[PDB]
Amino acid sequence: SPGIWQLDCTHLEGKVILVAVHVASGYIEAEVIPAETGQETAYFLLKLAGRWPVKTVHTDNGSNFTSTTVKAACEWAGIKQEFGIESMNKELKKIIGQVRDQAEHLKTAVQMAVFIHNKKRGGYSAGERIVDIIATDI
């Protein structure tokens, strides 16, 4: 469970936002991409696996089983793709809405929204939780 992620897509302003959630913490990473092409997901997954333990990525549809570059990225980095395992996507759009005028590019708003999600709660934030799970594991 230190290494289990979910990968989803949400849409704002005709752009695609790639969302990775660390299922045990609620920690999120996101990127705005022009078009959802296989090569985009592959770059995002390779960046995520260089940064954290990424052992299993669950997706809720078939799109990610049809990309040879996602498959090649996953092989290289030692990532198992799994089919099946959220309301994360709703929280994110709430925060993105509050900040949308505060900056020009959708992608800056997306990252401010990831920052608030990860750093907010007095218990632990999702950001402390992921470090605590992986530390506690090491």
Add this chain to the structure above:
Amino acid sequence: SPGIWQLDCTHLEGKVILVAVHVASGYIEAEVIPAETGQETAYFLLKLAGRWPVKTVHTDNGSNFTSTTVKAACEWAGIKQEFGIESMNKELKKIIGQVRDQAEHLKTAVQMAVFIHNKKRGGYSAGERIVDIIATDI
């Protein structure tokens, strides 16, 4: 020291690679950017601060004191910019060289190289070190 980073630039194939090193671990993040414009560094810094504790960013030159968007990003996220505090850039180009044919875009090679740097050593890797410092700190 959990929150202290260095930010540098290196160059390959007429593109700029933005490198953040967590000084106490040797953990690195990198991005290929078209052109070094203020807005690029600002997006990278906001992504890094959503992911980790980023309290102080040291740079070795003046470029980052002249961008209103780096300044605005740093204010919003609570980042102190500092002037002054590597051979990281040499290790990275060694690994990038070994993988360069293994993939099309320079940026994929850059990320495979970050992955190897972060996961390699039997002591601790830079990736376990950063999680151990922040966990040990929390």
